Design a protein around this motif. Structure first.
Motif, PDB file in Angstrom:
ATOM      1  N   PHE A   1     -45.022  29.578 -73.807  1.00  0.00           N
ATOM      2  CA  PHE A   1     -44.199  30.027 -72.884  1.00  0.00           C
ATOM      3  C   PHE A   1     -44.156  31.495 -72.979  1.00  0.00           C
ATOM      4  CE2 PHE A   1     -41.068  26.387 -71.867  1.00  0.00           C
ATOM      5  CZ  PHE A   1     -41.971  25.131 -72.405  1.00  0.00           C
ATOM      6  N   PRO A   2     -42.637  31.858 -71.770  1.00  0.00           N
ATOM      7  CA  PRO A   2     -43.049  33.415 -71.584  1.00  0.00           C
ATOM      8  C   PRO A   2     -41.767  34.063 -72.808  1.00  0.00           C
ATOM      9  CG  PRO A   2     -43.278  32.456 -69.522  1.00  0.00           C
ATOM     10  CD  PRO A   2     -43.088  31.122 -70.337  1.00  0.00           C
ATOM     11  N   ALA A   3     -42.283  35.285 -73.144  1.00  0.00           N
ATOM     12  CA  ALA A   3     -41.987  35.766 -73.766  1.00  0.00           C
ATOM     13  C   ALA A   3     -40.650  36.058 -73.477  1.00  0.00           C
ATOM     14  CB  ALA A   3     -42.102  36.925 -74.623  1.00  0.00           C
ATOM     15  N   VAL A   4     -39.303  36.284 -74.451  1.00  0.00           N
ATOM     16  CA  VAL A   4     -38.153  36.503 -74.055  1.00  0.00           C
ATOM     17  C   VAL A   4     -38.026  38.455 -73.974  1.00  0.00           C
ATOM     18  CG1 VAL A   4     -36.341  34.952 -74.439  1.00  0.00           C
ATOM     19  CG2 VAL A   4     -37.209  36.157 -76.301  1.00  0.00           C
ATOM     20  N   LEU A   5     -36.990  39.056 -73.818  1.00  0.00           N
ATOM     21  CA  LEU A   5     -37.112  40.425 -74.707  1.00  0.00           C
ATOM     22  C   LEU A   5     -35.364  40.833 -74.977  1.00  0.00           C
ATOM     23  CD1 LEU A   5     -38.264  43.253 -74.800  1.00  0.00           C
ATOM     24  CD2 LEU A   5     -38.054  44.062 -72.330  1.00  0.00           C
ATOM     25  N   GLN A   6     -35.156  40.388 -76.124  1.00  0.00           N
ATOM     26  CA  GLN A   6     -34.067  40.409 -76.628  1.00  0.00           C
ATOM     27  C   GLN A   6     -33.319  41.964 -76.570  1.00  0.00           C
ATOM     28  OE1 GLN A   6     -35.523  37.755 -80.092  1.00  0.00           O
ATOM     29  NE2 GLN A   6     -35.937  39.461 -80.429  1.00  0.00           N
TER      30      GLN A   6
ATOM     31  N   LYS B   1     -41.372  34.721 -83.517  1.00  0.00           N
ATOM     32  CA  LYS B   1     -40.045  35.591 -83.271  1.00  0.00           C
ATOM     33  C   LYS B   1     -40.409  37.574 -83.314  1.00  0.00           C
ATOM     34  CE  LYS B   1     -35.671  36.252 -85.874  1.00  0.00           C
ATOM     35  NZ  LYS B   1     -34.663  35.722 -86.773  1.00  0.00           N
TER      36      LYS B   1
ATOM     37  N   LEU C   1     -42.820  29.478 -83.596  1.00  0.00           N
ATOM     38  CA  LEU C   1     -42.079  30.496 -82.935  1.00  0.00           C
ATOM     39  C   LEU C   1     -42.521  31.842 -83.168  1.00  0.00           C
ATOM     40  CD1 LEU C   1     -39.355  31.660 -81.822  1.00  0.00           C
ATOM     41  CD2 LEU C   1     -38.130  31.002 -84.058  1.00  0.00           C
TER      42      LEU C   1
ATOM     43  N   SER D   1     -39.860  37.727 -77.799  1.00  0.00           N
ATOM     44  CA  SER D   1     -39.805  36.305 -78.921  1.00  0.00           C
ATOM     45  C   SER D   1     -40.700  35.490 -78.035  1.00  0.00           C
ATOM     46  CB  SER D   1     -38.314  36.643 -79.674  1.00  0.00           C
ATOM     47  OG  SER D   1     -38.472  37.213 -80.714  1.00  0.00           O
ATOM     48  N   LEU D   2     -41.676  34.289 -78.393  1.00  0.00           N
ATOM     49  CA  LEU D   2     -42.265  33.595 -77.982  1.00  0.00           C
ATOM     50  C   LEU D   2     -42.232  32.312 -78.761  1.00  0.00           C
ATOM     51  CD1 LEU D   2     -45.693  34.267 -76.217  1.00  0.00           C
ATOM     52  CD2 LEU D   2     -45.697  32.878 -77.622  1.00  0.00           C
ATOM     53  N   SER D   3     -42.727  31.696 -77.747  1.00  0.00           N
ATOM     54  CA  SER D   3     -42.668  30.072 -78.442  1.00  0.00           C
ATOM     55  C   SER D   3     -43.963  29.210 -77.877  1.00  0.00           C
ATOM     56  CB  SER D   3     -41.518  29.271 -78.558  1.00  0.00           C
ATOM     57  OG  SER D   3     -41.394  29.447 -77.822  1.00  0.00           O
TER      58      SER D   3
END
Ligand SMILES: *[C@@H]1O[C@H](CO)[C@@H](O)[C@H](O)[C@H]1NC(C)=O
Ligand code: NA
Lengths: 212, 211, 183, 216, 224
Positions: free
Chosen positions: E175-180, E152, E150, E186-188
């Protein structure tokens, strides 16, 4: 050779002034404008013919391209009355213009004329200087004619003019008729005839040598 | 400012032929070039000078250019042909290379695949740093549309949820990942947390427990 | 075979003077008769070699340097010259052994609105060495305080655009320069 | 702040030599285009010389072969070496920072250079006695036969400033300057208030107070 | 044998500058024209600028004209693109490509098109602050078992994730990253490995965050 026109320019506070700067051939947009007040250093106004320098008020507007360039002051102000120069940029010569003097335009005022005989202390030295004063007048165009026994004197008199007064925008003139003691004592009547726009006729101030 | 216009989307069944137009003022007077771009990859030239192909490009790709409409014609469409396509010319007037808006080629007739959900509890290292994040991973599903919902015990949770938008994989399938940020006290208070993944009415649900 | 002189002189577009290009020419027979018998060149001065008497000479390497400057600035492309071009853009050595070729290109490099493809270096701490090339774009610190890459007062970008317009005088019109070097 | 302070101006005979300085603060002399620009009395601006940041120097045709521009990096100072001076070189000399294209945004206050063969002489101060003036009186002082410029004239040691007109000096045919300073005062204060003009000529260390009184 | 390496990208504040570089190898550099083409995330290709074989600047995009300056050095087989007064609309992935053909080719050719393309360097124009990520092991919980890492809370993009110094590629999916909503990514990344292989081969994810000089190698292993 940078031909700038006009040499002198009269305007009022709040007017729109246009100064022209002509180059002998195309200089694209390489031109700068300066503002210089009496006794002060020049101040850069606009570079590249149309870029107002940071800090200069929005009154000064620069335009023109090719062979004719203009400096435009939208609303003239009391602190804008000065001499303005244009300079060729990006050249080996750094050529300047002759300059354009912007002066104030007020009501016509006639000069208060006074004449001063040479003092007794100066006559002891062998030289006589007669002084003719023209006080607080406008415009600057004035003519001072020296008369000695009704003989018009030319070739032995110099004169000087002050700058425009910071308060009333008037000029003053001082003319000095320089003679020697013997030439001063061979004659009797000494007068200076003043002609000015504010006078309906040439006014003359005179004195007689030896008489109080 | 020359401007090129391509259709934003084109759909073609497998085995058929696709036509992607590229409009422009007297575009037939200019050489037109086409580029393919797969998801996450760099553009690759496929057609140049109206109708020429580089080495390694199958003969299925062809191009034409006439009048005010250049066209990319790809015959015997495979599922791997699903990608983006841009046309480009040279604007000699404005001295500028111009690209088209792009055409997303989508190949129809692909079987609907169920999402594979993987859920990880908060790591022991993160919990020691007074943080807690639940990682729900969604991969290998089609079409690229999915609704994610979190559950505490049996009640939903809406705060602290971040979810990606579906992105197409290399196999023309789609993937996503949702994150649930919690405090170390919230993760240890409830008996379990669940990640519900809805897709075409079907819902796959995975659950994790503390320790 | 023949030397690729037609690629450099008859090139589609030339480089800026600050980023003057250099093409190495070797392993070819040079037919200089195409050059000195051309009435299309405005400037053609050779230093250390006679122009007509070059077809019977051989050299290890021949370098061709091309760029575009103002017409007034062409006089700076010579040994022992000073000025913004010779000092901060393209400097020829005092013992230069080669020829300088230039011609008016107002019909090619001048734009009505103002060209952006031809630039020159305006600020630099010191004069360039002979055949030195500086394409750096570091913010020039003219004042006492540093600039840390931000423009402003006493912090000027070292490059300036010519902005060739067709209505400019011949001194301000673009001139394509090609410098040939021998050794 | 940002300022240029120049010095070294003085009176010098034709053919002589003089060196002008220009200390800088807020601007690095070695990193800028630095120029000298002069202005003859009552004339326009004339560019004299320039030194590029790389060291290259260029001069105007009127001063070529006679003027030399240079700088000292450790002192952040610009210099203007002048030799074989001529009468037409008389001007106020400014040092200015050129922004590269030719435009000069920073200027100094300027130092004055006067090139003339004439010798120094203190002026004679003669009174311009008041007579009949009309509604108000008018007297003055004649500051005659001095060299070189300038002279300073005050009235009543500065207590009288209103109505004072100190005229520019004229260069007489003898090569000596001569000006007059006048002031208008009320006719009723003629026999009550004392009027004394204060002339100072620093080149000759001359200080003269002349009492002007009505002539009888 | 024909690649175009690009660097210089990263995070830059609005108004500052940034200089990109494109290195060429395996072909005569002083023979082809070179171009810069940028691409915002999810948007189309926009040609930035180009330069011919003889270092001749050949136009600019209307939004970048006057701010960008492109140049090349044939002695170093490299291409450069100076970017000044950057704005948020400049946030894009900048590519570097070569062009076969004429006009700006070494001779009188036609128009071969943009042949090879580089992988691009990402330029992010934001006033936010760079932050290195925090890496946590995603322990597998007991066929095949799934484990990962993770990545993060980091900024900006991108981050690179490998496994066992690249020796492990099969079964891996990043997986692609989120944009919190906090503004951080954050990527995993997950690997699939057989259940009966945990005690044998060790698994280590290699996270690299160049904009913050952060390289972390985390040992993922079963928990308890
Ligand atoms: C350039 O091309 C013209 C014809 O377009 C030709 O006459 C001339 O000789 C060429 N010059 C060089 C140096 O190749
Ligand atoms: Na400038």
């Amino acid at each position: 050779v940078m031909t700038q026109s006009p040499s002198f320019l009269s305007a009022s506070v709040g007017d729109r002034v246009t100064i022209t700067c002509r180059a002998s051939q195309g200089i694209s947009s390489y031109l700068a404008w300066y503002q210089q007040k009496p006794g002060k250093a020049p101040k850069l106004l606009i570079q590249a013919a149309s870029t107002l320098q940071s800090g200069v008020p929005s009154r000064f507007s620069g335009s023109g391209s090719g062979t004719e360039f203009t400096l435009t002051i939208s609303s003239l102000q009391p602190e804008d009355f000065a001499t303005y120069y244009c300079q060729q940029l990006n050249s080996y010569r750094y050529t300047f213009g002759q300059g354009t003097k912007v002066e104030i335009k007020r009501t016509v005022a006639a000069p208060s004329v006074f004449i001063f005989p040479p003092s007794d202390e100066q006559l002891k030295s062998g030289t006589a200087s007669v002084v003719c004063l023209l006080n607080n007048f406008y415009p600057r165009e004035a003519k001072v004619q020296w008369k000695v026994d009704n003989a018009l004197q030319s070739g032995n008199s110099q004169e000087s003019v002050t700058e425009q007064d910071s308060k009333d925008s008037t000029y003053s003139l001082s003319s000095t008729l320089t003679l020697s003691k013997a030439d001063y004592e061979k004659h009797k009547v000494y007068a200076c005839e003043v002609t000015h726009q504010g006078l309906s006729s040439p006014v003359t101030k005179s004195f007689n040598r030896g008489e109080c | 400012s020359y401007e090129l216009t391509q259709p934003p989307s084109v759909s073609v069944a497998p085995g058929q032929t696709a036509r992607i137009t590229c409009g422009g003022n007297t575009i037939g007077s200019k050489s037109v070039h086409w580029y393919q771009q797969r998801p996450g990859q760099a553009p690759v030239l496929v057609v140049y000078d109206d109708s020429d192909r580089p080495s390694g490009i199958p003969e299925r790709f062809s191009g034409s250019n006439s009048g005010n409409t250049a066209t990319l014609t790809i015959s015997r469409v495979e599922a791997g042909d699903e990608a983006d396509y841009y046309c480009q010319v040279w604007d000699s007037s404005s001295d500028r290379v111009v690209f088209g808006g792009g055409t997303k080629l989508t190949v129809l007739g692909q079987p609907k695949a169920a999402p594979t959900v993987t859920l990880f509890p908060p790591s022991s290292e993160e919990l020691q740093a007074n943080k807690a994040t639940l990682v729900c991973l969604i991969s290998d599903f089609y079409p690229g549309a999915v609704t994610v919902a979190w559950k505490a015990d049996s009640s939903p949770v809406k705060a602290g949820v971040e979810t990606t938008t579906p992105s197409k994989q290399s196999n023309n399938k789609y993937a996503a990942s949702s994150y649930l940020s919690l405090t170390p006290e919230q993760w240890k208070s409830h008996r379990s947390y669940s990640c519900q993944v809805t897709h075409e009415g079907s819902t796959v649900e995975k659950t994790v427990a503390p320790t | 075979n023949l030397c690729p002189f037609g690629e450099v002189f008859n090139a589609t577009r030339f480089a800026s003077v600050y980023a003057w290009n250099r093409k190495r020419i070797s392993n070819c027979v040079a037919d200089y008769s195409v050059l000195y018998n051309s009435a299309s060149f405005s400037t053609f001065k050779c230093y250390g070699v006679s122009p007509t008497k070059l077809n019977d000479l051989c050299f290890t390497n021949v370098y061709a340097d091309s760029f575009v400057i103002r017409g007034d600035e062409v006089r700076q492309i010579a040994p022992g010259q000073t000025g913004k071009i010779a000092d901060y853009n393209y400097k020829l050595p005092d013992d230069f052994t080669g020829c300088v070729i230039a011609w008016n290109s107002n019909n090619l490099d001048s734009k009505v609105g103002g060209n952006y493809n031809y630039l020159y270096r305006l600020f630099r701490k010191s004069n360039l060495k002979p055949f030195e090339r500086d394409i750096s774009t570091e913010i020039y610190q003219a004042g006492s305080t540093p600039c840390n890459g931000v423009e402003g007062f006493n912090c000027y970008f070292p490059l300036q655009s010519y902005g060739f317009q067709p209505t400019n005088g011949v001194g301000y019109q673009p001139y394509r320069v090609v410098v040939l070097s021998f050794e | 702040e940002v300022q240029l302070l120049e010095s070294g101006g003085d009176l010098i005979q034709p053919g002589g030599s003089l060196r002008l300085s220009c200390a800088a603060s807020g601007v690095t002399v070695s990193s800028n285009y630095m120029s000298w620009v002069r202005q003859a009395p009552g004339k326009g601006l004339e560019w004299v010389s320039i030194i590029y940041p790389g060291g290259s120097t260029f001069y105007a045709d009127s001063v070529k072969g006679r003027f030399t521009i240079s700088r000292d990096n450790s002192k952040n100072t610009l210099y203007l070496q002048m030799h074989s001076l001529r009468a037409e070189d008389t001007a106020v000399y400014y040092c200015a920072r050129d922004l590269g294209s030719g435009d000069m945004d920073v200027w100094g206050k300027g130092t004055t250079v006067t090139v003339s063969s004439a010798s120094t002489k203190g002026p004679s101060v003669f009174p311009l006695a008041p007579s009949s003036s009309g509604g108000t009186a008018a007297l003055g002082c004649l500051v005659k036969d001095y060299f070189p410029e300038p002279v300073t004239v005050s009235w009543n040691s500065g207590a009288l400033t209103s109505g004072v007109h100190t005229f520019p000096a004229v260069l007489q045919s003898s090569g000596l300057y001569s000006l007059s300073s006048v002031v208008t005062v009320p006719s009723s204060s003629l026999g009550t208030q004392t009027y004394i003009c204060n002339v100072n000529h620093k080149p000759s260390n001359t200080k003269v107070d002349k009492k002007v009184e009505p002539k009888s």
